[PDB]
Design a protein around this motif. Structure first.
Motif, mmCIF file in Angstrom:
data_model
loop_
_atom_site.group_PDB
_atom_site.id
_atom_site.type_symbol
_atom_site.label_atom_id
_atom_site.label_comp_id
_atom_site.label_asym_id
_atom_site.label_seq_id
_atom_site.Cartn_x
_atom_site.Cartn_y
_atom_site.Cartn_z
ATOM 1 N N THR A 4 68.064 -15.346 -5.079
ATOM 2 C CA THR A 4 68.097 -14.028 -4.856
ATOM 3 C C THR A 4 66.718 -13.202 -4.874
ATOM 4 O OG1 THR A 4 68.572 -13.402 -6.994
ATOM 5 C CG2 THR A 4 70.326 -14.008 -5.639
ATOM 6 N N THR A 16 59.659 -2.021 -4.625
ATOM 7 C CA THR A 16 60.832 -2.720 -4.870
ATOM 8 C C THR A 16 60.653 -3.497 -6.206
ATOM 9 O OG1 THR A 16 59.920 -4.794 -4.045
ATOM 10 C CG2 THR A 16 61.113 -3.453 -2.361
ATOM 11 N N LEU A 74 64.397 -2.814 -7.404
ATOM 12 C CA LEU A 74 64.808 -3.818 -6.793
ATOM 13 C C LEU A 74 64.803 -5.170 -7.481
ATOM 14 C CD1 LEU A 74 66.059 -1.917 -4.799
ATOM 15 C CD2 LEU A 74 65.046 -3.074 -3.052
ATOM 16 N N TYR A 110 74.078 -14.768 2.237
ATOM 17 C CA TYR A 110 75.390 -14.847 1.083
ATOM 18 C C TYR A 110 75.436 -16.362 0.576
ATOM 19 C CZ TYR A 110 79.993 -14.642 -1.090
ATOM 20 O OH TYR A 110 80.819 -14.639 -2.059
ATOM 21 N N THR A 125 73.477 -9.080 -7.912
ATOM 22 C CA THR A 125 72.639 -8.942 -6.845
ATOM 23 C C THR A 125 73.499 -8.464 -5.419
ATOM 24 O OG1 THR A 125 71.256 -10.113 -5.336
ATOM 25 C CG2 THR A 125 72.838 -11.241 -6.636
ATOM 26 N N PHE A 126 72.893 -7.613 -4.542
ATOM 27 C CA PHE A 126 73.491 -7.524 -3.201
ATOM 28 C C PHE A 126 74.426 -8.317 -2.634
ATOM 29 C CE2 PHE A 126 73.830 -4.686 0.514
ATOM 30 C CZ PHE A 126 73.931 -3.645 -0.239
ATOM 31 N N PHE A 127 73.737 -9.439 -2.284
ATOM 32 C CA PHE A 127 74.799 -10.602 -1.348
ATOM 33 C C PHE A 127 75.061 -11.539 -2.495
ATOM 34 C CE2 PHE A 127 74.408 -9.796 3.119
ATOM 35 C CZ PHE A 127 73.914 -8.897 3.239
ATOM 36 N N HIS A 128 75.490 -11.310 -3.870
ATOM 37 C CA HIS A 128 76.008 -12.022 -4.844
ATOM 38 C C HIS A 128 77.110 -12.978 -4.394
ATOM 39 C CE1 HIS A 128 76.586 -13.314 -8.873
ATOM 40 N NE2 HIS A 128 77.810 -13.175 -8.539
ATOM 41 N N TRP A 146 73.727 -0.319 -8.224
ATOM 42 C CA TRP A 146 75.126 -0.483 -7.790
ATOM 43 C C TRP A 146 75.883 -1.570 -8.646
ATOM 44 C CZ3 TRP A 146 71.026 -2.222 -5.255
ATOM 45 C CH2 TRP A 146 70.769 -3.601 -5.200
ATOM 46 N N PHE A 201 70.541 -2.950 -11.194
ATOM 47 C CA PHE A 201 70.592 -2.563 -9.758
ATOM 48 C C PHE A 201 71.269 -1.412 -9.764
ATOM 49 C CE2 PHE A 201 70.008 -7.214 -9.371
ATOM 50 C CZ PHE A 201 68.673 -7.263 -8.678
#
Ligand code: HEA
Ligand code: HEA
Ligand code: CU
Ligand code: CU
Ligand code: CU
Ligand code: MG
Ligand code: NA
Ligand code: ZN
Lengths: 261, 84, 227, 56, 75, 47, 43, 514, 98, 84
Positions: free
Chosen positions: A187, H211, H215, A182, B68-71, B62, B60
């Motif tokens: 990223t 990915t 991703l 986090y 991004t996921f852990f944005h 979602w 993405f």
């Protein structure tokens, strides 16, 4: 014949291999639905039938070993080879990811700025939390060792005590890693540095969660008196897998966190 | 550096419980202290629209498909620049 | 180019391609030797009523069939490695043309002095003029000076392609973000055809390469007229 | 704690002609019928999706 | 000048760096001579060479990047 | 274990009637060989 | 390899039949698709 | 009862049988695709209308034959059936798991079929290299489906590779050393090790492509500083051990077949034959880059790879000559399988010799990506791995079933397919030397004859595979039960009769410690 | 440290595990975990092959480093001999059946 | 590269005698061949009087005290230049 005179286990027909095969069909095609038709119902069903299968399959394995006495010496020696082999196949899985990383860092394309880490990337400090995670994992390696010796000496309480400390260190590493993710200024989408970092450290992270639920299982089987000071393979496998997990972290640490940054 | 602590880093549940509380855990305490001492929160890095970062060849699966996921909004700029 | 009912390699237009023809003849001679030997010994084995089914001693004969194949491999590996270093050998090119694969056409670039660059496409068989080769003709040939050491630099602007031209004995994949080098050097003027040698999608089969080799002088005028 | 592994040992060694995945009780059967139902339904659902997806 | 000569420091089939090195070398020299004047003398050789070897689109996208200030290389 | 044994009993398809088998083996291999052909027809009938 | 004689021998006529059915099950379905290829290519 | 036996199995035999059935069916699919491929090329022009359909067809052919026919049959079929029988084990080490290894195959095949149904399918070549395989050039669920089909097929094998090594190693009669197990067993133990080590790398490589497609990673995208060539390394690292994973079991079956029909008690040079396989297995891990001679690598490394790739001929050579030594002075029984064995011995030879030519990177420059390599690999795969599968199948059919095949029909089948495959692949050597590229749905007019002859050949083989289905049918239709089997003293798999009872070896064999 | 609590095999092993456990300490091997040791194999000193039935497969490694084991069913009755090396084998009722 | 040779790279004097003659020695033969194949004797390198080489702060305890122990006249120049 009729009655067997070999020391091997003839397993009863189990509906688990089908239910686990079908399980993978649901999960993969379910991941295709998500990735393209942005739907998760299929993937959710797959993950469910998957846990159900792993639950009962390993349940029966305990039933046959602990309750029905099928794991003779001949049988355990075979379970040993299987786990060793399984771990080896996993060493080679992580081997493609370190390959990917070195291929990328030892020769940075001009699109990166012709250098490593690429321009624009602000890597984390290896001396900050990455060192903490290293000490946490290494400590659990010594505490899991103390737990194994207690077991062999029949010290019920201390085995429970060492296994508990070990389990909480794995959870500690998991939380720390979660926060690092986090807080990180990069990223998966930040090129090959982010790609290479998040999937290698990511898969290992998933491996710590799988190694910790394995030890949690070992914890409960112990509360329930399943292991004897001499026959306790589930814990050895649990411990072998846990050591595989530190080693991969030391290789990750020295390579991506230290050298590659 | 190196290492060498007299003897006994082998065999005996007692010896291993000894290392656990006398080496292993005290280390985690030190490193934890060090980590908590340099907990200096970095300033969000300046945003420059570099082309090899913030990659996006497919949205993405979602959210707005651009997150991004852990944005973490404070240190992660979107392709166009910082969240706010 | 290749003609109907061909068996071997297209005729060598450059010196390495001749070099390869001879090596291949050398190598082929040997595979003919070995494969006829293995066929003779088999029919020999199957052609007698005499039997000896008792245990036989191995090893003794095992050294022959182990050291002999090793000597042969050295007899191929040497000639082979020579031509290989020869291919990646230090020459000094007097020209540098670039080529870039694209999903279904090559574009060439001569930018040594001017900034010449053009696309190159296969001529729809519908519009070929009598005598033109069906899937081989391009609208804009890549003109180059015969008898000269040219340096080609292959790349691509999308997927992978592979720049090939048999007669000269060249093949170099076209990989995005990479500049692969290759040395061209014809010793005869003419038209030399080649085709994309890396699957790149639907028309992988329809993006050929045609080399037109003329003397320097005509090369210079062409180049300019080309812009 | 307990240590009633012998109670379990007898239960699972009981000659009731059952396969180990059922040997344990009534819940074994419900769990079993649930797993089989979700797998079969899921496999059907996925087949439906492939059909839906295999047309423009 | 005919075309870029052999360069021992980039002796293999892969020349991607040869293009890249000369494009940096040039612009860095250019920038220097500017931030020095030095009778505004110029480092043409690098521009000749990188011009020969680099595909046009690389050179264009690179110049663009330098314009918008997102060229990842250090000049 | 009430699993039959012997010739024709250790397989998942009945082999008692040679004609019903002729028909099962036909749908079996036959359907495999036809699948590719109809997958192509399918791609050719899309837009 | 020795063996008992056939429990249910397959006379020539029977074989001829089975050889025919086997062949058609391979050739017909493909023949149909291939025979109509142009129609498909016509939309 | 049908369910418990066939869906809930824990029997090496019932599983091995389940594999042969899957294998035979997938074999039917791949044959069809190989015929569409040649239908398209049997005449100048375009038949299929669009080129993407052709590529989709060529790609599927390779995966079906490799992952769903050859592998299931040779390892899952013959492997499960014969391994426990030849070393005297009651079953495989992990009976329940073994069943999963099978059941993962049908879903895996469903995913591969689905991929050619959705969108335009995956016309990427069986090497599924990016960028062509990426989300720009191949946007959509197809390649992703192809990537998942391989994830499952790989888990199934890695899983069973663990079963065979543990079985073959941990469950032999206590007095029997490894230097006492039959060569087929050695062949599958070594094949299993290759799977254990190579398959995980592919799984990593194709995960990275996945990915990159969903991703936003850029492992193989230059933009992110990636490298399409890195994928080529990962894939080919698995890709070479794989070509050997496909021939080793066949090497083993052939060793058994040639010895049995020469009336010998054992194959010539047993230990040398063990050394040969182990060598081939080891060298097969340091040669991958010969699959990348026109990609831009440093000459010195291109030189290392041709040298390393050549030393493999030595060990392989001792096996070709050992099999010959085994026929020497044998009392030869000209049975169908002996014909399949003799064909393999020669055709595999030609095809491996042709692969020595390609080992030469200099010459590979101009042979690479042409039909010369399609010739090379079809000789060893179509006339090597396949010939071994046929010889082994006709040889062990009576053991699996208890019924015998018609030996005369069995020989016509050989005689037809021998002509067919040769007529199909021989001309292709020419087409490649003369420049015709691979993965082409059409060719310059000059190439018309050889592709015309070649396609015709492909039609003869089809005839041979239709006749085969018939041969199996009539075998089951007439019901000629087996009575006496020869040479059982040295051939333990035949000691419990045809077919062996559900549970063989409930009471171990007895082997003395001299 | 100090303390106890974990069961022993001697006190918790059940099923066949327990069966091979005890049998093993009595010196006997009813489950064929170890390798039978040869006798002179003469006509008057045959290798006694225990069996829970009336025929058992015998593998004979005629000569020490032999790679080929000669297999054959030994039946209840007069001592039989390895087809390749003579060597007598005589069936015998298998003991510890539990 | 990597490695994986089927099985048996452990326990048994026979197994170890097997690896000795089947892997170990054949290797030494190959490497020996390679070494004997690139036995290309280098030309003696050009001599330039660099100050960080041919060091001499105290004469050697043997010979003219200016000649190194395994002095090979053909490739080793004295401080002043090649032997001859
Ligand atoms: C084992 C692998 C295998 C096998 C046997 C074959 C078999 C066939 N293949 Fe090949 N093929 C590949 C693997 C295989 N192929 C691969 C890897 C490629 C490359 C793809 C790419 O480029 O990406 C390829 C490419 C390819 C091409 C090149 C297309 C192109 O590049 O443009 C061609 C064309 O002629 C071709 C032809 C054939 C033909 C005519 C058959 C015929 O021989 C078929 C004859 C029938 C058989 C030999 C099988 C019958 C056996 C059984 C069904 C078992 C029966 C079961 C029991 C007895 C239990 N194949
Ligand atoms: C059954 C699997 C199989 C087998 C066993 C082999 C075995 C070999 N292959 Fe093959 N090969 C393929 C299947 C196989 N290959 C496939 C599928 C491809 C294409 C992949 C793709 O791109 O789609 C391919 C591709 C391929 C290439 C790259 C072509 C290119 O794209 O440019 C190379 C190059 O070195 C090669 C070499 C070899 C060699 C050295 C052998 C050796 O193992 C053969 C050894 C055999 C012998 C040499 C004969 C026996 C020995 C003697 C009788 C002794 C005497 C011999 C001498 C003196 C030389 N193969
Ligand atoms: Cu192309
Ligand atoms: Cu192409
Ligand atoms: Cu290879
Ligand atoms: Mg290629
Ligand atoms: Na065509
Ligand atoms: Zn004997």
């Amino acid at each position: 014949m009729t009655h067997q005179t070999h020391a091997y286990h003839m397993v009863n027909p189990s509906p688990w291999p089908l239910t686990g095969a079908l399980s993978a069909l649901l999960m993969t095609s379910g991941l295709t639905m998500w990735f393209h038709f942005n739907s998760m119902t299929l993937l959710m069903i797959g993950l469910t039938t998957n846990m159900l299968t792993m639950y009962q399959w390993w349940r029966d394995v305990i039933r046959e070993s602990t309750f029905q006495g099928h794991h003779t010496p001949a049988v355990q020696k075979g379970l040993r080879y299987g786990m060793i082999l399984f771990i080896i196949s996993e060493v080679l899985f992580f081997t493609g990811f370190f390959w990917a990383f070195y291929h990328s860092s030892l020769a940075p394309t001009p699109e990166l700025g012709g250098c490593w880490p690429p321009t624009g990337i602000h890597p984390l400090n290896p001396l900050e939390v990455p060192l903490l995670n290293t000490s946490v994992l290494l400590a659990s390696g010594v505490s899991i060792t103390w737990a194994h010796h207690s077991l062999m000496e029949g010290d019920r309480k201390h085995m429970l005590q060492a296994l508990f400390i070990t389990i909480t260190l794995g959870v500690y590493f998991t939380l720390l890693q979660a926060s690092e993710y986090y807080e990180a200024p990069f990223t998966i989408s930040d090129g090959v540095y982010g790609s290479t970092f998040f999937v290698a450290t990511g898969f290992h992270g998933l491996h710590v969660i799988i190694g910790s639920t394995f030890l949690i299982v070992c914890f409960f089987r112990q509360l329930k008196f399943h292991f004897t000071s001499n026959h306790h393979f589930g814990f050895e496998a649990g411990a072998w897998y846990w050591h595989f997990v530190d080693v991969v972290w030391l290789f990750l640490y020295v390579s991506i966190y230290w050298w590659g940054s | 550096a190196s290492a060498a602590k007299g003897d006994h880093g082998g065999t005996g549940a007692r010896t291993w419980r000894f290392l656990t509380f006398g080496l292993a855990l005290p280390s985690v305490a030190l490193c934890t202290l060090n980590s908590w001492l340099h907990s200096g929160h970095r300033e969000r890095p300046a945003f420059i629209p570099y082309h090899h970062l913030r990659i996006r060849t497919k949205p993405f699966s979602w959210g707005d498909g651009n997150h991004t996921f852990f944005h973490n909004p404070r240190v992660n700029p979107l392709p166009t620049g910082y969240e706010k | 180019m290749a003609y109907p009912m061909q068996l071997g390699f297209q005729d060598a237009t450059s010196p390495i391609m001749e070099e390869l023809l001879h090596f291949h003849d050398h190598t082929l001679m040997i595979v003919f030797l070995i494969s006829s030997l293995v066929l003779y010994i088999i029919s020999l084995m199957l052609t007698t009523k005499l039997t000896h089914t008792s245990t036989m001693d191995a090893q003794e004969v095992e050294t022959i069939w182990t050291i002999l194949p090793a000597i042969i491999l050295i007899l191929i590996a040497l000639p082979s490695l020579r031509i290989l270093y020869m291919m990646d050998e230090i020459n000094n090119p007097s020209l540098t043309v670039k080529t870039m694969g694209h999903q279904w056409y090559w574009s060439y670039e001569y930018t040594d002095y001017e900034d010449l660059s053009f696309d190159s496409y296969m001529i729809p068989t519908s519009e070929l003029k009598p005598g033109e080769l069906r899937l081989l003709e391009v609208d804009n040939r890549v003109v180059l000076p015969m008898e000269m050491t040219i340096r080609m630099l292959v790349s691509s602007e999308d997927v992978l392609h592979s720049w090939a031209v048999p007669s000269l004995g060249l093949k170099t994949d076209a990989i995005p973000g990479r500049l692969n080098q290759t040395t061209l050097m014809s010793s005869r003027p003419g038209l030399y055809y080649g085709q994309c040698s890396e699957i790149c999608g639907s028309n992988h089969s329809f993006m050929p390469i045609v080399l037109e080799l003329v003397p320097l002088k005509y090369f210079e005028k062409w180049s300019a007229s080309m812009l | 704690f307990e240590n009633r592994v012998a109670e379990k040992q007898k239960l699972f060694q009981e000659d009731n002609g059952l396969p180990v995945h059922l040997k344990g009780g009534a819940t074994d059967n419900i769990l079993y019928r649930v797993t089989m139902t979700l797998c079969l339904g899921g496999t059907l659902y996925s087949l439906y999706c492939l059909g839906w997806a295999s047309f423009p | 000048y005919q075309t870029a000569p052999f360069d021992s420091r980039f002796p293999n089939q892969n020349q991607t760096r040869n293009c890249w090195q000369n494009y940096l070398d040039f612009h860095r020299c250019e920038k220097a001579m500017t931030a020095k004047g030095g009778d505004v003398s110029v480092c043409e050789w690098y521009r000749r060479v990188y011009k020969s070897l680099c595909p046009i689109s690389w050179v264009s996208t690179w110049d663009d990047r330098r314009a918008e200030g997102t060229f990842p290389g250090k000049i | 274990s009430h699993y039959e044994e012997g010739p024709g009993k250790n397989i998942p398809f009945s082999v008692e009637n040679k004609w019903r088998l002729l028909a099962m083996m036909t749908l079996f291999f036959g359907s495999g060989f036809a699948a590719p052909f109809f997958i192509v027809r399918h791609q050719l009938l899309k837009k | 390899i020795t063996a008992k004689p056939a429990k249910t021998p397959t006379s020539p006529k029977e074989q001829a039949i089975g050889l025919s059915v086997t062949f058609l099950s391979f050739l017909l379905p493909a023949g149909w698709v291939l025979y109509h290829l142009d129609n498909y290519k016509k939309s | 009862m049908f369910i418990n036996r066939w869906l809930f199995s824990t029997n090496h035999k019932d599983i091995g049988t389940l594999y042969l059935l899957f294998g035979a069916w997938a074999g039917m699919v791949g044959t069809a695709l190989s015929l569409l491929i040649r239908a398209e090329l049997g005449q100048p022009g375009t038949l299929l209308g669009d080129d993407q359909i052709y590529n989709v067809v060529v790609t599927a052919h390779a995966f079906v034959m490799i992952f769903f026919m050859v592998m299931p049959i040779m390892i899952g079929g013959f492997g499960n059936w014969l391994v426990p029988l030849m070393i005297g084990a009651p079953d495989m080490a992990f009976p329940r798991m073994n069943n999963m290894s099978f059941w993962l195959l049908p879903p895996s095949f469903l995913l591969l079929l689905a991929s050619s149904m959705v969108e335009a399918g995956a016309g990427t070549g069986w090497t599924v290299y990016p960028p062509l395989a990426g989300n720009l050039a191949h946007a959509g669920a197809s390649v992703d489906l192809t990537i998942f089909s391989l994830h499952l097929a790989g888990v199934s094998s890695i899983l069973g590779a663990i079963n065979f090594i543990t079985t073959i190693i941990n469950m032999k009669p206590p007095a029997m050393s490894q230097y006492q197990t039959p060569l087929f067993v050695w062949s599958v133990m070594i094949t299993a090790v290759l799977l254990l080590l190579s398959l995980p790398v592919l799984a990593a490589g194709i995960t990275m492509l996945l990915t990159d497609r969903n991703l936003n990673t850029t492992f193989f995208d230059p933009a992110g500083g990636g490298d399409p060539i890195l994928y080529q390394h990962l894939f080919w690292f698995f890709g070479h051990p794989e070509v050997y994973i496909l021939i080793l079991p066949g090497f083993g079956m052939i060793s058994h077949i040639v010895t049995y029909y020469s009336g010998k008690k054992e194959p010539f040079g047993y230990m040398g034959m063990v050394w040969a396989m182990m060598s081939i297995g080891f060298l097969g891990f340091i040669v991958w880059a010969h699959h990348m001679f026109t990609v831009g690598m440093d000459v010195d490394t291109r030189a290392y790879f041709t040298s390393a790739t050549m030393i493999i001929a030595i060990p392989t050579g001792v096996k070709v000559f050992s099999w010959l030594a085994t026929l020497h002075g044998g009392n030869i029984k000209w049975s169908p399988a002996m014909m399949w064995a003799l064909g393999f011995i020669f055709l595999f030879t030609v095809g491996g010799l042709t692969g020595i030519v390609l080992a030469n990177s200099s010459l590979d420059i101009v042979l690479h990506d042409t039909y010369y390599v399609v010739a090379h690999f079809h000789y060893v795969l179509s006339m090597g791995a396949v010939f071994a599968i046929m010889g082994g199948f006709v040889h062990w059919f009576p053991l699996f079933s208890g019924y015998t095949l018609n030996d005369t029909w069995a020989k016509i089948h050989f005689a037809i397919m021998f002509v067919g495959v040769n007529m199909t692949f021989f001309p292709q050597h020419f087409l490649g030397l003369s420049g015709m590229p691979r993965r082409y749905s059409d060719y310059p007019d000059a190439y018309t004859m050889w592709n015309t002859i070649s396609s015709m050949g492909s039609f003869i083989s089809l005839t041979a595979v239709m006749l085969m289905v018939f041969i199996i049918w009539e075998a089951f239709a007439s019901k000629r039960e087996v009575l006496t089997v020869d040479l059982t003293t040295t051939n333990l798999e035949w000691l419990n009769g045809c077919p062996p009872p559900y549970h063989t070896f409930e009471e171990p064999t007895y082997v003395n410690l001299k | 440290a100090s303390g106890g609590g974990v069961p022993t095999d001697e006190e918790q092993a059940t099923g066949l595990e327990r069966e091979v456990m005890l049998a093993a300490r009595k010196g006997q091997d009813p489950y064929n975990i170890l390798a039978p040791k040869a006798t002179s194999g003469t006509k008057e000193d045959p290798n006694l092959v225990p069996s829970i039935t009336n025929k058992r497969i015998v593998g004979c490694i005629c000569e020490e480093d032999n790679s080929t084991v000669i297999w054959f069913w030994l039946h209840k009755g007069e001592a039989q001999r390895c087809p390749s090396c003579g060597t007598h084998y005589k069936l015998v009722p298998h003991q510890l059946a539990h």
